[PDB]
Design a protein around this ligand. Structure first.
Ligand SMILES: *[C@@](C)(CO)[C@](*)(O)[C@H](CC(C)C)NC(=O)[C@H](Cc1ccccc1)NC(=O)[C@H](CC(C)C)NC(=O)[C@H](CCc1ccccc1)NC(=O)CN1CCOCC1
Ligand SMILES: [Mg+2]
Lengths: 250, 240, 235, 222, 211, 195, 244, 231
């Protein structure tokens, strides 16, 4: 046995292209649409819960994931790749930061660590790149609210608002017209639901849409009282009912 | 670990990777070595395709391995740094364990051995570098000039050149260099080295580097003006 | 591509057979064994007149009682010589005696097939290992990159090998003197060499019980060349 | 605390002649004040006309002999059935001993045979490989009892020629095998009287060009 | 043990006793404490017989491979340093060696003291062993540079005798060596028993002893 | 080894080191130089357990000489002293620590100032006008505290050093066989052949 | 076995070139142009962001100009993810040097170290090289202000003015024309922006498509200051030089 | 064809070509014969030279006092396998004070060769061996193929033209098996057997190599004037 693939599977072609990264980006293009919008007092991330079968319980499959109490993530592309990246991202937030500094990492540095993991899958021996693009929304004390995109290459960019996957080109155009620097969080949620309706074919309700926010601190979700400085997680996943309420005022 | 055999024999008994490494040397800038009666001179070509260069900080072509030995090269520049570092480490290791500085022959044998090792080790390619190693042994006044190449073979030379258009300058040296009476002085040795490079270089401005090594760790690099005076005198005699 | 340790349909290792082709391109080396000693001679083959020929070292001492000549990719021989010298001296450490020529040769040949995917390829050099010991007397061995070694009364390796071997077939007899063997190596080298044989482009050496392994001076070889010319002109 | 060493007693003796050599040793094996065996061989024919005896801590002695016998076997395989000379064996044994410089073989060791000129040879080893060719050597429990006797009766030490009064020494005349075996038996009979770990039996191995011969003599069993 | 060596005009003298001890018991009296590394290099032994023998024999093999690769006999300084670095690896582990590396090379006669503690010293006069302290008295008092070979050989011999007499763990016989630029020369084995009486009569020394 | 002293004056650094090497009850040598030139304007004296001292000094020497060749530039005495300290601080938590104390005397050609650093086997570094290792400072510091000025000449520094050595020779029970003295200044390193 | 699928990233071509290094350089030629200009009283680093969007958060964005320490900075051309791997290694090397010698690392030593890492990927390991070219701008007390470049081959050279990435041929010609030795920082700032403005593939050169930085002794007395320009500050210098 | 690049690849008909190519190297090798009675076992080997100046390559190797083999094919591979046998015979003696059974020696060689046929990177052994020995169950003869297959036989032959000697032994089976307590007659039958594989060349003094082991006979090799008796 032994892993005898100690050589790179991603290499430069004569034209300068890294083929496997391009092909990974093509897989991301085929994936279901997801988006993110940044407001003055929050960030929203959203996607469609594309259920593979009606017998399948789509509540058990979480496309939007908590990484830290103040950082959340959503993806487009290959689901299994995303699931393992979330596991690694959650762990690296502890091992490379929280266990050292005693606090959760700021958004940009956690993004930097995830990016590194994805870059290594693009150069290390005997592996293919991750077939996902991530959208990571988060908050921290000194940088405020922020939204980042991470690609299969490991490259990451900060966005005011953006979209990835199936109908990203049309969705990004829609967001350019609606976005301004004075948006409140509720306005951003409203715009997110409008943008996402264009890329969805079938049912459009709280059960087929997954949406989460980075906003105010939630002391009711903390689970304990007694420490003034601990005020609760800023990440919150909107319920099926909470989504439907905002679809009536749509 | 990556164990792949990159340097292997072909049906006609050739190791192509080693032979392709010699092609990288052929592409490299010209380097020349000439030993006089009491000195050795190392000449090096600088391609003038690169101007706006900062000549203060740009890596010089001739490298000191120890206070009494120098090394110039032709081929891949990045590869040469690895050999030079290894040679420098070995030079200090020899002083440390044997309480004498390396002989020029010993240092050459080490560098050549490193080059050979990279022609039959798994997962590595040969060095695309040929070197000219020159200097004087400790407490000796006999000039030493050696050459190495990617295959790992080495040998001593009265005068030798490597790199691009080395065929032309070797032709010049073969008819101009007399073994019975070598360049008696430093001037004659430098003049012959500059003359040989002028067959290939193009302009005699900032394209020629000269480094003179004398006995007892006396090593100095000539400046642009000093070299330019040689270039002037050579062509003025040529107009006849 | 294909494995480095692959057999051909004829039952030969591709790489070993290809390394033998590299040895055919090498400079000529000849060895002759007599009851008075073993003689080793080589073609230096300088690529240019500016190359100082005395730095070309194709004949090498392994121990006082064992010498060695090489042909092929000579850079590959350095680690083999190093191993041989270590093996010879190590045996002297463990057993307080000289090592048998055959045992030394066997130790060198054990390295040969240590290649795969250890070193990445076989050696591209053949060795003539000559020496003397108390048990089997004066001996000459031919060590190949296949791991095989044959003992020889006389042997030539390199570019002019098959032409030289046919000449050694006729000339060798069991009563050869050392002086006769010296002239015989010079004769056959002069025959297969491209350039004209002299003291600067050819080198002689021998191994005797009394004096041990010796590389001949250029002044000493020059006289043997002059002695050869006169005896050929004598008839 | 576990003590990996022990003392099994025993005493050995090697004497070199002009064209022969003997290696003798008692056959008694002991721990403390108990007898384990009255006949437990301690001197072995190791091949190539070499005899060997290593003991003190029996387990380490058995291992060393076993390893040297193995070394002889592999010397033949690797060097075309060449005969291992006594001087080559001695040097080989040094390296077997020093390989455990930091967990020594707790033994006295002596080998005997013939040198390459056919003359008798005896080599002596300390536990970590310091070896010496000698004419006469005793090792083990009663070594200090025997050696002074051999200095006197083999090398004629402190013996001068009558009439001269200390001016001229007794000349070093060689000894015969029969004369040597007498000194051996007298040495071990004397050692048996005054040393409690020596007794029961005496086994002698004689080495000539013809081969290796054995002789056995009883000793006191108290 | 008692061993000594000293540089002088005509090379270097090396002398040593031959006694080996195991407590109060004299195990041997025929030990060669001078090892011939090469025709131009000698090594002395003091302390652990096994240790000194093994490491100096292993050094002689290092010095030989040096000659093969370099076509040049090793220097006294390089040889002494190879030993020193070898024993330094096992420092604190229990090694017991007190050696002198004597020879003639390009810089002329050379003499280095090397021990298991880590010392490596160049010097014109050394003496190591339990009886060294007695030998130093005779050396220091009679040592010149302009000493004849005959007188130098006697000095080294007389110095060992002084130590062999007083030191209980020194004696047996004296081994002499003289190292020239043409190599070392063995100058015999001299029984102390016979040598003592001879020196007493010819020199007049040891008046306190009766004979 | 025994006594190593150092004094930084106006334009130079002076290092005085004992000559004796001792094995038990016997003086093996009386002319030992307990110093290595690390670079043309940096000198290091040393003292500690046998073997460790020379092995460490020569190891440092090799590293600084390697740096000099690689960069064609001489490291500042401060940079060298920091390198040495790290090697000793690394050593002290190793399986078998180097038992060595050093003084580093150098002339910084950039600042045109002499500099003296004292470093013990633990990796404890201190820059000083004068310093000593072992039992040396116990006898000498009172004289240095009294007589030392920072504007002293090299000749005045040597006279004060003679006074320090005279006190050592009077009150120390051990005979250290005098000292080898070396001066480090702008022109390099030299030995005072008469002291 | 696995041999079947090995691309063999570290081999010579018959012409004596390294395939992957050459193809990596081809990749870098499509990256945004980065320019470095060295003056007597400072260094300028200018670089063009690649086809941005209006929704990109520029003030918190960094894809071209990175800080290695207080004295040294780099401009990037190629794969950003690959560059960040190397940048973090260089930051660690600079701190190791500072811890060892208690002095800031000389510029060349840092450059040589990174270039040696790049070289290693071309000679052993069987991995693809880093698709990155750097422009190093830095200062130390030996050589003063220095500009270097390194590429995937691991080869590095010193410069007075240099460009990497797209349109370097055109850019280098323009720099060679207008550059002079007695030039100052303010003049060098103008030269860098003018060169980008002429070589750019975009319709017009604006503040949102640029990253800019200077290394000046224009810090209070004998010391060096790094200035990574803000979006508003790039907008002002574009008006000052007369481009917008 | 497409399935002979390495040892780890079966062909569509279930064949291992690299093993078959290794088997081919044996057929190119010089002839060697093995046969036994109830008391003794004999090896006879035709040695091969490079030319008239060269020596004749040795074919027979001793493994222990009671066991040894003859080779045909790559000689270095025989040195590796015989060295392994020497160690295994030796392990049995040192640990169990037991002479290694010839049948068990065959099982060990089989398993060592097999590992080289199932793993990537390595290669099969390119040599065939004839092992003879005398143990607690009497005389034995084994044939080793580098495919891994080991076979106990009354007699056999391997190498070039080995079919001639193998046919002779198949006829003589009933005769030579009964040659008990007569070493010279058993060798005669072996020398007569190997003679059936000769063409052009004949058995000379430095050409022939014989080895024998038996009840009160340690494994000994005969070369030179020691085999002139049987010519
Ligand atoms: C003078 C004579 C003494 O100082 C010299 O220094 C000589 C130098 C010569 C021999 C090269 N040194 C000795 O004689 C030396 C003194 C000594 C002893 C032990 C350790 C260090 C130094 N003696 C030996 O080395 C003897 C030599 C024998 C008698 C031939 N060897 C022993 O005593 C051995 C070695 C033991 C040993 C060393 C290191 C690790 C483990 C073991 N020991 C024994 O034989 C056991 N000994 C037998 C006597 O009863 C007590 C146990
Ligand atoms: Mg009793």
């Amino acid at each position: 046995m032994t892993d005898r693939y100690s050589f790179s599977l991603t290499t430069f072609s004569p034209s300068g292209k890294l083929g496997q990264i391009d092909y990974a980006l093509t897989a991301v293009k085929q994936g279901v649409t997801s988006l993110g919008i940044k407001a003055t007092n929050g960030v929203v991330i959203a996607t469609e819960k594309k259920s593979s079968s009606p017998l399948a319980m789509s509540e058990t499959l979480s496309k939007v994931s908590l990484l830290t109490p103040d950082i959340g993530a959503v993806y487009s592309g290959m689901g299994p790749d995303y699931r393992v990246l979330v596991d690694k991202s959650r762990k690296v937030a502890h091992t490379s930061y929280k266990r050292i500094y005693g606090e959760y990492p700021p958004t940009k540095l956690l993004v930097s660590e995830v990016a590194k993991i994805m870059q290594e899958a693009t150069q290390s021996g005997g592996v293919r790149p991750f077939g996902v693009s991530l959208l990571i929304a988060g908050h921290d004390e000194f940088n405020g609210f922020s939204l980042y995109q991470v690609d299969p290459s490991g490259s990451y960019f900060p966005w005011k608002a953006t979209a990835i996957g199936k109908g990203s080109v049309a969705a990004k155009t829609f967001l350019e017209k609606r976005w301004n620097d004075e948006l409140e969080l509720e306005d951003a949620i409203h715009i997110a639901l409008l943008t996402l309706k264009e890329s969805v074919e079938g049912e459009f309700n709280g059960d087929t849409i997954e949406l989460a926010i980075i906003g105010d601190e939630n002391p009711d979700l903390l689970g304990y009282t007694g420490i003034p400085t601990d005020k609760g997680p800023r990440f919150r996943k909107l319920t099926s009912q909470e989504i439907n309420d905002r679809l009536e005022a749509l | 670990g990556y164990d792949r055999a990159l340097s292997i024999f072909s049906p006609d008994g050739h190791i192509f990777q080693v032979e392709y490494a010699l092609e990288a040397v052929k592409r490299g800038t010209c380097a020349v070595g000439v030993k006089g009666k009491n000195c050795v001179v190392l000449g090096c070509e600088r391609r003038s395709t690169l101007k706006l260069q900062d000549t203060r900080i740009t890596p010089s072509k001739v490298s000191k391995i120890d206070s009494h030995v120098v090394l110039s090269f032709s081929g891949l520049n990045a590869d040469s740094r690895i050999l030079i570092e290894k040679a420098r480490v070995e030079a200090q290791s020899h002083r440390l364990t044997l309480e004498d500085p390396v002989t020029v022959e010993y240092l050459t044998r080490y560098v050549a051995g490193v080059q050979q090792r990279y022609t039959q080790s798994g997962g590595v390619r040969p060095f695309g570098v040929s070197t000219l190693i020159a200097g004087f042994d400790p407490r000796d006044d006999e000039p030493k000039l050696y050459q190495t190449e990617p295959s790992g073979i080495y040998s001593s030379w009265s005068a030798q050149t490597i790199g691009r258009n080395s065929k032309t300058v070797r032709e010049f040296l073969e008819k101009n260099y007399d073994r019975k009476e070598p360049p008696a002085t430093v001037e004659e040795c430098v003049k012959l080295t500059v003359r040989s490079l002028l067959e290939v270089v193009q302009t005699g401005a900032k394209n020629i580097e000269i480094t003179v090594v004398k006995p007892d760790s006396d090593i100095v690099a000539l400046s642009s003006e000093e070299i330019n005076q040689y270039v002037t005198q050579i062509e003025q005699e040529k107009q006849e | 591509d294909r494995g480095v340790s692959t057999f051909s349909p004829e039952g030969r290792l591709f790489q070993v057979e290809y390394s033998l082709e590299a040895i055919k391109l090498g400079s000529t080396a000849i060895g002759i064994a007599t009851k008075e000693g073993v003689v080793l001679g080589v073609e230096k083959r300088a690529t240019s007149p500016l190359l100082e020929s005395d730095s070309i070292e194709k004949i090498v001492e392994i121990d006082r009682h064992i010498g060695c000549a090489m042909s092929g990719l000579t850079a590959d021989a350095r680690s083999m010589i190093e191993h041989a010298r270590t093996a010879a001296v190590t045996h002297n450490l463990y057993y307080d005696e000289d090592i048998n020529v055959e045992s030394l040769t066997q130790s060198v040949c054990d390295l040969a097939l240590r290649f795969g995917e250890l070193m990445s390829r076989p050696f591209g050099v053949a060795l003539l290992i000559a020496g003397h010991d108390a048990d089997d007397g004066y001996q000459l061995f031919h060590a190949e990159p296949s791991g095989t070694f044959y003992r020889y009364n006389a042997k030539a390796i390199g570019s002019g090998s098959e032409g030289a071997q046919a000449e050694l077939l006729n000339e060798w007899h069991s009563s050869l003197t050392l002086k006769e063997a010296e002239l015989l190596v010079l004769k056959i080298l002069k025959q297969v060499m491209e350039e004209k044989l002299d003291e600067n482009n050819a080198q002689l050496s021998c191994i005797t019980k009394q004096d041990g392994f010796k590389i001949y001076d250029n002044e000493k070889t020059a006289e043997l060349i002059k002695e050869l010319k006169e005896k050929e002109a004598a008839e | 605390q576990f003590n990996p060493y022990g003392d099994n007693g025993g005493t050995i003796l090697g004497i070199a002649g002009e064209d022969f050599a003997v290696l003798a040793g008692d056959t008694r094996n002991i721990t403390d004040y108990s007898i384990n065996s009255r006949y437990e061989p301690k001197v072995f024919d190791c091949g190539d006309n070499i005899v060997m005896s290593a003991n003190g801590f029996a387990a380490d002695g058995d291992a060393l002999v076993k390893r040297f016998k193995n070394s002889v076997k592999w010397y033949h395989f690797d060097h075309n059935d060449k005969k291992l000379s006594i001087n080559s064996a001695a040097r080989n044994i040094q390296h077997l001993l020093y390989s455990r410089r930091f967990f020594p073989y707790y033994v006295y060791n002596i080998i005997a045979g013939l040198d390459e000129d056919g003359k008798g040879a005896v080599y002596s080893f300390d536990p970590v490989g310091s070896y010496q060719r000698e004419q006469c050597r005793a090792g083990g429990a009663a070594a200090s009892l025997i050696m002074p006797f051999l200095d006197n009766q083999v090398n004629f030490k402190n013996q001068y020629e009558p009439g001269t009064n200390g001016k001229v020494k007794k000349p070093l005349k060689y000894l015969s095998v029969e004369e040597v075996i007498k000194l051996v038996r007298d040495s071990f009979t004397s050692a048996t009287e005054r040393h409690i770990q020596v007794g029961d039996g005496l086994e002698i191995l004689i080495v000539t060009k013809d081969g290796v011969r054995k002789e056995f003599y009883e000793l006191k069993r108290d | 043990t008692t061993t000594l060596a000293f540089k002088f005009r005509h090379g270097v003298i090396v002398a040593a006793d031959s006694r080996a001890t195991a407590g109060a018991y004299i195990a041997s009296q025929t030990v060669k404490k001078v090892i011939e590394i090469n025709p131009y290099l000698l090594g002395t032994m003091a302390g652990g017989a096994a240790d000194c023998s093994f490491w100096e024999r292993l050094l002689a093999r290092q010095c030989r491979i040096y000659e093969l690769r370099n076509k040049e006999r090793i220097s006294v300084a390089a040889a002494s340093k190879l030993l020193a670095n070898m024993v330094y690896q096992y420092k604190g582990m229990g090694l017991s060696m007190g050696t002198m590396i004597c020879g003639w090379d390009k810089r002329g006669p050379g003499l280095y003291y090397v021990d298991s503690e880590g010392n490596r010293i160049s010097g014109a006069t050394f003496s190591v062993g339990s009886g060294s302290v007695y030998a130093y008295g005779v050396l220091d008092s009679n040592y010149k540079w302009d000493l004849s070979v005959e007188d130098a050989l006697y000095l080294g011999k007389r110095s060992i005798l002084a130590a062999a007499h007083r030191d209980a763990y020194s004696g047996g016989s004296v081994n002499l060596y003289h190292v020239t630029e043409d190599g070392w020369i063995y100058h015999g084995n001299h029984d102390v028993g016979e040598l003592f009486w001879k020196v007493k009569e010819e020199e007049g020394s040891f008046n306190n002893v009766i004979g | 080894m025994d006594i190593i002293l150092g004094i930084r004056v106006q334009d130079s650094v002076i290092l005085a080191s004992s000559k004796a090497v001792t094995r038990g009850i016997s003086v093996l040598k009386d002319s030992d130089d307990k110093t290595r030139q690390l670079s043309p304007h940096t000198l290091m004296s040393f003292a500690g357990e046998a073997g460790d001292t020379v092995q460490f000094a020569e190891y440092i020497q090799a590293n600084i000489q390697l740096y000099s060749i690689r960069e064609d530039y001489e490291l500042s005495p401060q940079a060298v002293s920091s390198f040495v300290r790290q090697e000793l601080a690394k050593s002290i938590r190793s399986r078998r620590p180097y038992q060595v104390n050093v003084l580093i005397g150098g002339y910084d050609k950039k600042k045109n100032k002499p500099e003296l650093y004292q470093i013990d086997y633990l990796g404890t570094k201190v820059e000083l006008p004068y310093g000593a290792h072992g039992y040396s400072g116990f006898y000498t510091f009172s004289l240095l505290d009294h007589h030392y000025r920072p504007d002293m000449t090299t000749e005045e520094g040597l006279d004060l050093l003679k006074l320090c050595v005279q006190e050592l020779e009077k009150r120390m029970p051990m005979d250290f066989k005098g000292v080898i003295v070396k001066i480090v200044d702008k022109d390099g390193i030299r030995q005072v052949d008469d002291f | 076995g696995s041999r079947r699928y090995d691309s063999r990233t570290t081999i010579f071509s018959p012409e004596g070139r390294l395939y992957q290094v050459e193809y990596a350089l081809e990749s870098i030629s499509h990256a945004g142009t980065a320019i470095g200009i060295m003056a007597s009283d400072g260094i300028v680093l200018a670089a063009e962001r690649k086809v941005t969007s209006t929704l990109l958060e520029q003030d918190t964005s960094t894809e071209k100009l990175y800080k290695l320490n207080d004295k040294i900075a780099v401009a990037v051309a190629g794969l950003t993810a690959d560059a960040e791997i190397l940048i973090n290694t260089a930051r660690i090397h600079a701190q190791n040097y500072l811890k060892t010698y208690n002095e800031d690392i000389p510029v060349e030593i840092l450059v040589r170290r990174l270039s040696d890492i790049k070289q290693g990927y071309t000679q052993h390991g069987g991995l693809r090289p880093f698709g990155v070219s750097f422009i190093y701008a830095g200062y130390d007390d030996r050589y003063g202000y220095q500009l270097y470049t390194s590429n995937p081959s691991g080869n590095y050279t010193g410069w007075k003015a240099i460009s990497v990435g797209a349109n370097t041929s055109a850019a280098q010609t323009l720099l060679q024309m207008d550059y002079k030795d007695d030039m100052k920082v303010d003049d060098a700032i103008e030269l860098a922006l003018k060169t980008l403005s002429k070589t750019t593939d975009s319709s017009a050169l604006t503040y949102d498509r640029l990253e800019f930085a200077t290394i000046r002794k224009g810090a209070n007395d004998g010391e060096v200051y790094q200035k990574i320009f803000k979006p508003q500050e790039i907008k002002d210098i574009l008006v000052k030089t007369g481009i917008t | 064809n497409n399935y002979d690049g390495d040892t780890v690849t079966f062909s569509p008909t279930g064949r291992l070509f690299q093993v078959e190519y290794a088997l081919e190297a044996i057929k190119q090798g010089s002839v060697t014969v093995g046969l036994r009675s109830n008391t003794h076992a004999v090896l006879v080997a035709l040695k091969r030279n490079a030319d008239e100046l060269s020596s004749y390559q040795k074919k027979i190797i001793k493994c222990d006092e009671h066991m040894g083999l003859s080779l045909a094919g790559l000689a270095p591979d025989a040195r590796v396998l015989s060295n392994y046998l020497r160690q295994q015979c030796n392990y049995s003696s040192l640990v169990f004070n037991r002479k290694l059974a010839v049948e068990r020696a065959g099982h060990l060689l089989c398993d060592k060769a097999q590992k080289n046929t199932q793993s990537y990177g390595g290669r099969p052994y390119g040599v065939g061996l004839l092992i003879i020995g005398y143990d607690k169950s009497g005389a034995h003869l084994l044939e080793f193929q580098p495919s891994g297959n080991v076979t106990e036989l009354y007699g056999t032959a391997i190498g070039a033209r080995s079919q001639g000697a193998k046919t002779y032994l198949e006829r003589t089976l009933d005769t030579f098996i009964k040659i008990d307590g007569n070493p010279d007659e058993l060798i005669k039958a072996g020398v007569e057997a190997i003679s059936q594989s000769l063409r052009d060349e004949s058995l000379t003094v430095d050409n022939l190599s014989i080895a024998i082991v038996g009840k009160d006979t340690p494994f000994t090799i005969y070369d030179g004037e020691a085999v002139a008796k049987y010519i």
